[PDB]
Structures are given as structure tokens and as C-alpha cells.
Amino acid sequence: VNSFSGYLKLTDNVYIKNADIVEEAKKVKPTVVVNAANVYLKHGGGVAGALNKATNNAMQVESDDYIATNGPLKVGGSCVLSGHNLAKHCLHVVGPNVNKGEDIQLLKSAYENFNQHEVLLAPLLSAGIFGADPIHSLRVCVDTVRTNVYLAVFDKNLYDKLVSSFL
Ligand SMILES: CC(C)[C@H]1CCCN1c1ncnc2[nH]ccc12
Ligand SMILES: [Cl-]
Numbered sequence: 001v002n003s004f005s006g007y008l009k010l011t012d013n014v015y016i017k018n019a020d021i022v023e024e025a026k027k028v029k030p031t032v033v034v035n036a037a038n039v040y041l042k043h044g045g046g047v048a049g050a051l052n053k054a055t056n057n058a059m060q061v062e063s064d065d066y067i068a069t070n071g072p073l074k075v076g077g078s079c080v081l082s083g084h085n086l087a088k089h090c091l092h093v094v095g096p097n098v099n100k101g102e103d104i105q106l107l108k109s110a111y112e113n114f115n116q117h118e119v120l121l122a123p124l125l126s127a128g129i130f131g132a133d134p135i136h137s138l139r140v141c142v143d144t145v146r147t148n149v150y151l152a153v154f155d156k157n158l159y160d161k162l163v164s165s166f167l
Pocket of ligand 2: 036045046047127128129130
């Protein structure tokens with residue numbers, strides 16, 4: 001039993017809710033919140049810009065030190081950093097950005113990072129300003145993640161389409 005509330009159960013391990021991931025994280029304080037990161041951990045917009053804003057830029061400060069030490073992530077890769085005031089940890093995961101011409105097959109690799117964590121709060125990878133088809137992202141999530149994932153979808157109209165079209 002966990003404190004996530006109001007989720008629709010899509011499968012044995014995948015749950016979904018129309019919710020602002022920022023507000024969800026502040027309420028639940030999950031062990032792991034997933035960020036929709038880029039390889040430079042430059043949290044300027046989309047989910048990443050919103051999460052970073054909620055940390056008063058502490059996420060960005062920590063991220064800049066991480067990049068200065070380690071260099072950029074790989075597309076499809078991840079790193080674990082602090083969750084600041086939002087969660088114990090933040091798993092920064094880089095899905096392919098279609099508006100950069102990145103290979104959509106890497107979306108499965110991106111979701112594989114979730115399997116290293118028993119329970120996560122997360123957005124749909126490569127959705128929003130990353131330009132992938134969210135119905136596809138949900139399909140890959142369900143077919144790749146085996147741990148317990150609670151998906152927050154910001155857009156109510158998109159949420160209704162994902163549920164109604166879910167096979
Ligand atoms: C609409 C969703 C599929 C993705 C794509 C863009 C933004 N988005 C978000 N999802 C969850 N929580 C969020 N908080 C702020 C933005 C945001
Ligand atoms: Cl985004």
C-alpha cells in the first residue's frame with residue numbers, strides 16, 4: 001500500500017492520473033520523481049522547467065555541478081540526483097527529443113531506467129515539448145516498465161485520449 005490517490009489502473013504495475021506532476025510530488029513526497037531531462041540537465045521548460053522552478057532553482061544548481069564533473073548524459077540514459085523539496089530522489093531520464101531528430105527507438109531504453117526503482121512518479125517520456133506521440137510513449141511504458149509507475153498527465157484532453165485508446 002502506498003499514498004498515491006485517484007489513479008486509474010492500466011495494468012498490474014502501471015497507473016495514470018490527470019495531474020500536475022509538480023503538485024503531485026509536493027503532496028506525496030515519493031521516493032522517486034522522474035524528470036523529463038535532456039543530456040545537459042538544462043531544465044528550461046516543459047516538465048523539467050516546472051520541476052526545477054518548484055525547487056527554487058536548486059535542481060539546476062545541483063545539475064550544473066553534476067555535468068561539470070561527469071559530462072552529458074546519453075540519450076536513453078539517466079542519473080539519480082536529489083529530489084529536493086519534491087521527493088527523496090529525482091531520476092533524470094533522457095527520452096529522445098523528436099524536435100532534435102533523435103531516434104524514437106531509444107524511448108524503450110529510456111523507460112528501462114525505471115526498472116531500477118521499485119516505485120516511481122513519472123511523466124510520459126518524450127511527450128510534450130519532446131515531440132513524440134504520447135499514445136506511443138504510454139505503450140512503450142507499459143511494455144517496458146515492470147516496477148510500479150504512477151504516471152501524471154498534465155493535459156486533461158490528452159489524458160482522456162490515452163485512457164480511451166488504451167489497449
Ligand atoms: C502533458 C504531459 C504529457 C507532459 C508533456 C508536457 C508537459 N507535461 C507535464 N506532465 C506532467 N506534469 C507536468 N507539470 C508541468 C508540465 C507537465
Ligand atoms: Cl516536457
